[PDB]
Design a protein around this ligand. Structure first.
Ligand SMILES: Cc1nc(C)c(-c2[nH]nc3c2C(=O)c2c(NC(=O)NN4CCN(C)CC4)cccc2-3)s1
Length: 283
């Protein structure tokens, strides 16, 4: 862009590469995402056209949208770090619970907002969650629909072939991220769809018509799936207190309909003593 200069390469996203650009006119630092082009669908550009209005304190703000020379550029506000990085940086001691509680609360607020507007993220993960020195965390890289995208945060209904999945898939993803912050280890680190699915089955037990009505009708559901029993949560996410564990199990419900909503989660007693701490960030 004439008014932008790639100051750095933040990294390749899901929809294209992300560089740290400096706006030559306003002298501001932004996150420039180069979107992948053989014409660029007019229906897609209209979808992104809405996004600029979807403004929430917990959503990385989309500053502008440049569609020049059939090339699509998305300029976002620039945050200083992602949650994945922050966690690796806290691996020795682990993020303090008050911070974990604050980030979860904020993300639930953001999700509650998107969801009330019929918008799903679809691919929530640590790397898509941006944070700042102020202590805020935001949703980024929404699913606006050659590495190795992880399936670790993928909901079971998606892995089983459900096309019209709901906003519940985001709650599942956030539930996996929540558990990860607390234990400092991914909940379900699958390396293949089938592996991902079975690691989930081995922890929450293989779902059936009892815990998940209609499950045996899923497209990729095989009657030949191994039959695992459910594991105790006290063993799965220690040392999360009962309140935390209670909320987590509700976010990890098999039946998308039984899965707790973002707004409902906000009212959970776990956030009764929620505060907004400031992180010890290293930039
Ligand atoms: C580590 C890091 N250090 C900085 C300064 C980072 C950064 N600051 N502000 C942003 C970033 C982004 O990645 C980013 C962003 N990224 C994005 O959609 N692409 N991806 C980044 C990589 N992962 C695995 C998938 C999503 C979208 C809007 C704003 C920002 S990440």
């Amino acid at each position: 862009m004439e008014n932008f200069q790639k100051v750095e390469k933040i990294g390749e996203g899901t929809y294209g590469v992300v560089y740290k650009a400096r706006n030559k006119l306003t002298g501001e630092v932004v996150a420039l995402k180069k979107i992948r082009t053989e014409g660029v669908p007019s229906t897609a550009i209209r979808e992104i056209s809405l996004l600029k209005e979807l403004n929430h304190p917990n959503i990385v703000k989309l500053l502008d949208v440049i569609h020049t020379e059939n090339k699509l550029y998305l300029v976002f506000e620039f945050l200083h770090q992602d949650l994945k990085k922050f966690m690796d940086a806290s691996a020795l001691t682990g993020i303090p619970l008050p911070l974990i509680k604050s980030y979860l609360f904020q993300l639930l607020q953001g999700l509650a907002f998107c969801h009330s507007h019929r918008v799903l993220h679809r691919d929530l993960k640590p790397q898509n969650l941006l944070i700042n020195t102020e202590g805020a965390i935001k949703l980024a890289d929404f699913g606006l629909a050659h590495e190795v995208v992880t399936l670790w945060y993928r909901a079971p209904e998606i892995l089983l072939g459900c096309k019209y999945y709901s906003t519940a898939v985001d709650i599942w993803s956030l539930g996996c991220i929540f558990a990860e912050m607390v234990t400092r280890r991914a909940l379900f680190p699958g390396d293949s769809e089938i592996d991902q699915l079975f690691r989930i089955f081995r922890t929450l037990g293989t779902p059936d018509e009892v815990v998940w009505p209609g499950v045996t009708s899923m497209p990729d559901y095989k009657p030949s799936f191994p039959k695992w029993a459910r594991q105790d949560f006290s063993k799965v996410v220690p040392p999360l207190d009962e309140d935390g564990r209670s909320l987590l199990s509700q976010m990890l419900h098999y039946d998308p309909n039984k899965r707790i909503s973002a707004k409902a989660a906000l009212a959970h007693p776990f956030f009764q003593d929620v505060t907004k701490p400031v992180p010890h960030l290293r930039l």
